[PDB]
Amino acid sequence: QSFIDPKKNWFAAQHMKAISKRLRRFGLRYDDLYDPYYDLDVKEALNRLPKEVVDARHQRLKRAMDLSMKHEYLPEDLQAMQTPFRGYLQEMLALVKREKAERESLGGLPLYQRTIP
Amino acid sequence: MRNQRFSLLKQPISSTLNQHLIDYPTPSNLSYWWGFGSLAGICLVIQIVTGVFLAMHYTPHVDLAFNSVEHVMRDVEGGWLLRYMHANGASMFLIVVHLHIFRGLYHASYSSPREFVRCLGVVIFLLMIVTAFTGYVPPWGQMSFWGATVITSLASAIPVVGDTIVTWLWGGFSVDNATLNRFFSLHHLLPFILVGASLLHLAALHQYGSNNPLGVHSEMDQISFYPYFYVKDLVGWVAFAIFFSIWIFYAPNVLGHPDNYIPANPMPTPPHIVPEWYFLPIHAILRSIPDKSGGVAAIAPVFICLLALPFFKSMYVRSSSFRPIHQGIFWLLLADRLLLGWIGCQPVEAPFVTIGQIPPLVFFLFFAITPIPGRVGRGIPNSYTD
Amino acid sequence: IQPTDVKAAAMWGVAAATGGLYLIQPWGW
Amino acid sequence: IQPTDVKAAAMWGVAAATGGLYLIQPWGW
Amino acid sequence: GGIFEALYKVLMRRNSVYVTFVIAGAFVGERAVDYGVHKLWEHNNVGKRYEDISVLGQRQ
Amino acid sequence: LPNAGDFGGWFCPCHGSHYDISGRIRKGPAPYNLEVPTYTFLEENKLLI
Amino acid sequence: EAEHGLACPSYPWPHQGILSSYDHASIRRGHQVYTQVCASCHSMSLISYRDLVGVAYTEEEVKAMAAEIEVVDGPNDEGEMFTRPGKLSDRFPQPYANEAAARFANGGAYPPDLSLITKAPHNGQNYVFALLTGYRDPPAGVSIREGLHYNPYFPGGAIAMPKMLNDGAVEYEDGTPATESQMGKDVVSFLSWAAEPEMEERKLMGFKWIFVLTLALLQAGYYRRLRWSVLKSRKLVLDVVN
Amino acid sequence: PVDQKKYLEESCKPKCVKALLEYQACVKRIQGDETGNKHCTGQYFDYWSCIDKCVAQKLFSKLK
Amino acid sequence: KGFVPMKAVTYGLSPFQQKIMPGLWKDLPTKIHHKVSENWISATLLLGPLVGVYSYVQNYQEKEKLSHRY
Ligand SMILES: CCCCCCCCCCCCCCCCCC(=O)OC[C@H](COP(=O)(O)OCCN)OC(=O)CCCCCCCCCCCCCCCCC
Ligand code: HEC
Ligand code: HEM
Ligand code: HEM
Ligand SMILES: COC(=O)N(OC)c1ccccc1COc1ccn(-c2ccc(Cl)cc2)n1
């Protein structure tokens, strides 16, 4: 709406640089926080992506789980080379969700269901 | 299988112990906040072993119950150690579980796919409250009588089958020997239900594994439980046994009330009826309503809004490390559960009637202002994008 | 169809009242 | 074989002198 | 530093001797610490024991 | 408890019943008045339970 | 402001400390203040005669202290009760026959049992000392009933016990001047022992095991940092840049 | 045997001349009372909390 | 259930070639300044509403105590 855009609001342009600061020290992007175990639709958006794009995600996640075991951050040479908020996942995930809203208004079983634990 | 044998830990007689306690894959960045769960299973074993030996010298009769506890303290070999380990050990079992629960709220451990792990633990917290309350009556002092009167009569505000509830729970017209005898039988039984509900609560976590301090998918960097998280859990079992030994040998009566050293007299009332420290937050919500039937109906929405946290969805970020606004609400709820515990040991007067009505409202505004970040937050990748 | 699903399903609410007073006779309420 | 014999004996003389080490208790030595 | 190879030289290339050293070393250590607590106690409290009662034998 | 309260009535610090000495509730959640049983004199001052 | 009492100060008792013990010559003197000034209207009923042996008295002195009382014994072959001199196994004698006969001789008020009285109120050792040596004259405007006395430390301000520790009420057998403040200090050290007769076996076991457990904490922090050093210093190259 | 406590409770008054002077002024304000109901319990409890604090420091080193 | 195909190179030393203990008291002034200049809005949110409420109660109870004295 009107309280989340950072180039009009002042308190959204300080919430934006607070998450941008905290993502750079582990070298993560905002889309790496999306878990294929939380949402079964995120599992499908990653199977339609090229192999070289998913492999760079698995290597950013391993570099960051190694920095938090050792209790340290990326060195400041590598921290100026980081791009959080450069996305790879949001457009493919909106397409999978749009195809699921069409298969339900028209009848039709879901393509994948969650296992009951 | 293979054609001949190999390591004996991979044999069927020890497979369930190998794959779940030795070779089990664990995230490599788990901190010391992931250590309070095995610490709570040691506190449950201490209470069972100490209580089985205490029950060889206790008599559940109103003419004989207070004098059986002084006989243990004075004439049984090492018997003062058996009682002080059991009375102070119920305070250690509640400190450890309270720090366990606040880990799961900070890192959002109730989320998918781990909803059944959260809901099996709300049942465990209910069995712990009934067991500690029902066991505080067997010493039969002035606070073991005037606390079982204040709580069991609170079911007399239920509609019009509730006057038949209280005289069936009591076994008569008051708290007396029919009530002390059935509170003893249920107190030997409920810790063994608590054991079977803890093994069931662990089979639900070994279906998906554990969460981590970053909140992410972690299957690319995982090590085994032995020796890495066994030797750092052992640092936690020795730091605990030092802290537990300054409560048995140097301050064994700080965490109790002096009024439980007077034998029970139903003709006078003590001046102030206060529970143990770990029941003080729900005791201040229960006395905050100026209607009594609306007081029982404010304890049941505490256990309803706990059981209905993991079923709101739209939150893809889990950990509070990357969430700067929900992180500030966590430290503002913890300041409210410590202020509700202070109010629960004060007189019912001014000014503690206003300062005890606003924190029950702030406590219930935590579970309604969680899902609104589940809506405003999912439009962040379409605005902050570079 | 889907009406007959619930038009069945609310009489097990009541098969359960023929059952809920069958043994206990909950009286005061 | 013959190692496992004696290696049965070394810790068979541990029990003997480990339960001879928790009950009767000459304690100056 | 020569006591460190020499103490591993003799005892634990074996696993039953080792269990002697941790059981029998649990005793000399338990008596070395029970002795020091029992002498720091009767040095902080002089004139306060039971045998320091001047009228002990004589009630009548 | 007697000898205290918002009147001097029967202070109950169990969950906060401030009575008056007449027995009918002033400020609190006690849903009824106090029970009234049956008793009268013989001649002078002993009235029987 | 007089509804819970006045607050008592803090006295340096000789058994307060992490390695401090009971003064056993002051327990010996406080049993004599009890048995001559206090036992006429108060009971203990948890302490036996065999519990003073090795604490303040010899076994021969207790076998002549206990034989001065008559104790009821069970039925003979004719089915009747009798009395006998006391033994080592017997409890301290009761001044009254029940709680009803105890209120009748005291104006309705009941004098409590003193075998756990230092644990039963809050700040229970500084409260019993300051109450017994605290009988004062009332302030301007307060009136007391008849048969009640003004003690500012009692909750309410009006106690049904008269002042009983006067100068020279006990003849001490060791040459101590039996002042009011001396008998008050000596009877609280006796009453502290009676509530907690385990305090010396307890402070000596807790020094042995807190010390021994802080050595196992230094072993376990070395054992932890030794198994984790191959992971905490490894090098890793990965291919990704941003 | 003069009492050690009351000896000290007399030698601690030249340290609390203020809480005493506030008690003396209270009995003036209720001198010649009309209805009862006017005591000086508060300023009495403020003066004996002074006096009880020095004597706790020094009494137990004067008793055998 | 547990497989992510990967590509990386790791090097590692032996435990008995390093110094185990001295990395604790290493730069403790620098370690302390990092924790308190990053966690000072989470303690102003935990102790703040408790110091301010305890000040209100002690002031309320010191003005109804001096209004009951004659
Ligand atoms: C907006 C929410 C409104 C508030 C919450 C509801 C009212 C509060 C009352 C508390 C009880 C909650 C009962 C709800 C449990 C079942 C809800 C559920 O199934 O969620 C659906 C979720 C995903 O659903 P999906 O597979 O995508 O299909 C739906 C498409 N139409 O798939 C699942 O979650 C099911 C898989 C996990 C379920 C395992 C059991 C979890 C615990 C449920 C029992 C409730 C607690 C009782 C204690 C359990 C232990 C005895
Ligand atoms: C005149 C008989 C009598 C004597 C002698 C006596 N007491 Fe009492 N005592 C009583 C009565 C009556 C009460 C009840 C006071 C009340 O209920 O207000 C009481 C109460 C007490 C209390 C309880 C105070 C409280 O706050 O509950 C203590 C402690 C006590 N006495 C100690 C002693 C000691 C110590 C002695 C020996 C110096 C002693 N008493 C001698 C009759 C006596
Ligand atoms: C008798 C009481 C309990 C026992 C023995 C117990 C045991 C355990 C154990 C051993 C773990 C292993 C991982 C870890 O330590 O973090 C665990 C995890 C967990 N427990 Fe408990 N628990 C108890 C009570 C509770 C309660 C009261 C709750 C919540 C209301 C709860 C919720 C959880 C959750 C959510 C996890 C997983 C969190 C994560 O993996 O990040 N447990 N429990
Ligand atoms: C098989 C398991 C158990 C048995 C047989 C048992 C037995 C007893 C007995 C005989 C007493 C009375 C003696 C006394 O007052 O000390 C008692 C008291 C008590 N029990 Fe247990 N117990 C068991 C487990 C537990 C557990 C698991 C808890 C808490 C979660 C607990 C909490 C208490 C408490 C708080 C008291 C009151 C002690 C006091 O304050 O004096 N018990 N128990
Ligand atoms: C260890 O027990 C005490 O401290 N007890 O009990 C004798 C006590 C003593 C004095 C006053 C009050 C209590 C009880 O306080 C509370 C407050 C809430 N609950 C409760 C109990 C059971 C259930 Cl299901 C739900 C709520 N109990």
Automatic annotation (TrEMBL), chains C, D:
The keyword Transmembrane applies. It comes from the Eukaryota. The chain crosses the membrane at residues 11-29. Keywords: Membrane, Transmembrane, Transmembrane helix. This is Ubiquinol-cytochrome c reductase complex 6.7 kDa protein. The chain holds residues 10 to 38 of 52 of the full protein.
TrEMBL record, chain E:
Belongs to the UQCR10/QCR9 family. Component of the ubiquinol-cytochrome c oxidoreductase, a multisubunit transmembrane complex that is part of the mitochondrial electron transport chain which drives oxidative phosphorylation. The complex plays an important role in the uptake of multiple carbon sources present in different host niches. Keywords: Electron transport, Membrane, Mitochondrion, Mitochondrion inner membrane, Respiratory chain, Transmembrane, Transmembrane helix, Transport. It is found in: Mitochondrion inner membrane. Transmembrane segments: none annotated. One of its GO terms (cellular component) is respiratory chain complex III. This is Complex III subunit 9. The chain holds residues 10 to 69 of 72 of the full protein. It is a single-pass membrane protein. Component of the ubiquinol-cytochrome c oxidoreductase (cytochrome b-c1 complex, complex III, CIII), a multisubunit enzyme composed of 3 respiratory subunits cytochrome b, cytochrome c1 and Rieske protein, 2 core protein subunits, and additional low-molecular weight protein subunits. It comes from the Eukaryota. The keyword Calcium does not apply. GO terms for biological process: mitochondrial electron transport, ubiquinol to cytochrome c.
Automatic annotation (TrEMBL), chain G:
Belongs to the cytochrome c family. The chain holds residues 63 to 304 of 304 of the full protein. Its cofactor is heme c. GO terms for molecular function: electron transfer activity; heme binding; metal ion binding. This is Cytochrome c domain-containing protein. It comes from Arachis hypogaea. It is a single-pass membrane protein. One of its GO terms (biological process) is mitochondrial electron transport, ubiquinol to cytochrome c. Heme c binds at residues 38, 41-42, 161. The lineage of its organism: Eukaryota, Viridiplantae, Streptophyta, Embryophyta, Tracheophyta.
Automatic annotation (TrEMBL), chain I:
It comes from the Eukaryota. It is found in: Mitochondrion inner membrane. Belongs to the UQCRQ/QCR8 family. This is Cytochrome b-c1 complex subunit 8. It comes from Arachis hypogaea. The chain holds residues 334 to 403 of 403 of the full protein.
